[PDB]
From a paper:
Bacterial enhancer binding proteins (bEBPs) are specialized AAA+ proteins that are required to activate the sigma54-dependent transcriptional complexes. As transcriptional activators, bEBPs function to catalyze the conversion of RPc to RPo, causing the RNAP-σ54 holoenzyme to isomerize and promoter DNA to melt, leading to transcription initiation. The ‘Glutamate Switch’ pair (E-N) was identified originally in PspF as the E108 side chain adopts different conformations in the presence of ATP or ADP, forming or interrupting the interactions with N64 (3,11,16,22,27).
In WT protein, when ADP is bound, E108 does not interact with N64 albeit in the ATP bound or APO state, E108 interacts with N64 (Figure 6A, (16)). This conformation, which enables the ‘Glutamate Switch’ pair to interact, is linked to the ability of PspF being able to engage with its target, the RPc. The crystal structures of the E108Q therefore suggest that PspF E108Q variant could engage with RPc, irrespective of its nucleotide bound states. Such a conformation could contribute to the ability of E108Q to bind RPc and move RPc along the pathway of transcription activation despite its slow ATPase activity. E108Q, on the other hand, is hexameric irrespective of the nucleotide being present, suggesting that the reduced ATPase activity is due to a reduced hydrolysis reaction per se, and not due to gross defects in hexamerisation nor loss of nucleotide binding.
Numbering used by the authors: 9 to 81, 91 to 255
The structure:
């Protein structure tokens, strides 16, 4: 979430892309809300009453990924489960080259192939994928299929990292701090000192919004009082 102009521009882009049936590629670091953007593409589309299915490609080994996406024997895969809806594939760049070619087969031909006896399955799925890799760099290296990229990247949504939305950092920090005050029953958030603000604004936030929420919640809890402003931002609890 947030309100920097670069983020508002993303929301505008998403509102125009959502009604299309074309695949959308989301590029962004961890904690920038890629799955929320994918969900927004679905719910602003004509498919909104259909299924919204997610899969993280990085999480499964190659055989398990293959079966989870395309099914086997019956274990229906994620494409089948997303029929009439939207399938979100996260960490796309980790997909093995076998899975990449099979993904292209389903995209251009619009159907899954069955082992023996079973006829192929036709599927109608809107695809949204996400990564933080440099996919054109991977194409040059031969670790990502050029023909798949020629097809998947109809258009690209680039999510700005928190460090490039500096105006959003104190806005969101205040929001998360207030919510933590409610959780631990403090009567009022007593504010951030200038030292705290320097700490927040100078940090690069590799975990972006998710990390900001955790750091601020921990800091409010450790502070534990409404009697004076929060001075000590605990970035590293280790």
């Amino acid at each position: 979430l947030g309100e920097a102009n670069s983020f508002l521009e993303v929301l505008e882009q998403v509102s125009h892309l959502a009604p299309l049936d074309k695949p959308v590629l989301i590029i962004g670091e961890r904690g920038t809300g890629k799955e929320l953007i994918a969900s927004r593409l679905h719910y602003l589309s004509s498919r909104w009453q259909g299924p919204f299915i997610s899969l993280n490609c990085a999480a499964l080994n190659e055989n398990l990924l293959d079966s989870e996406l395309f099914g086997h024997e019956r274990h229906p895969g994620r494409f089948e489960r997303a029929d009439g809806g939207t399938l979100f594939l996260d960490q796309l760049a980790t997909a093995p080259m076998m899975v990449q070619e099979k993904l292209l087969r389903v995209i251009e031909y619009g159907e899954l192939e069955r082992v023996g006896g079973s006829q192929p399955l036709q599927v109608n799925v809107r695809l949204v994928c996400a990564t933080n890799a440099d996919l054109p760099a991977m194409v040059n290296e031969g670790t990502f299929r050029a023909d798949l990229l020629d097809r998947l990247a109809f258009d690209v949504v680039q999510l700005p990292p928190l460090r490039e939305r500096e105006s959003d950092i104190m806005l969101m920090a205040e929001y998360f701090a207030i919510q933590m005050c409610r959780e631990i029953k403090l009567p009022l958030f007593p504010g951030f000192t200038e030292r705290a603000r320097e700490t927040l604004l100078n940090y690069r936030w590799p975990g972006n919004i998710r990390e900001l929420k955790n750091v601020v919640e921990r800091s409010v809890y450790r502070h534990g009082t409404s009697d004076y402003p929060l001075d000590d931002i605990i970035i590293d609890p280790f």
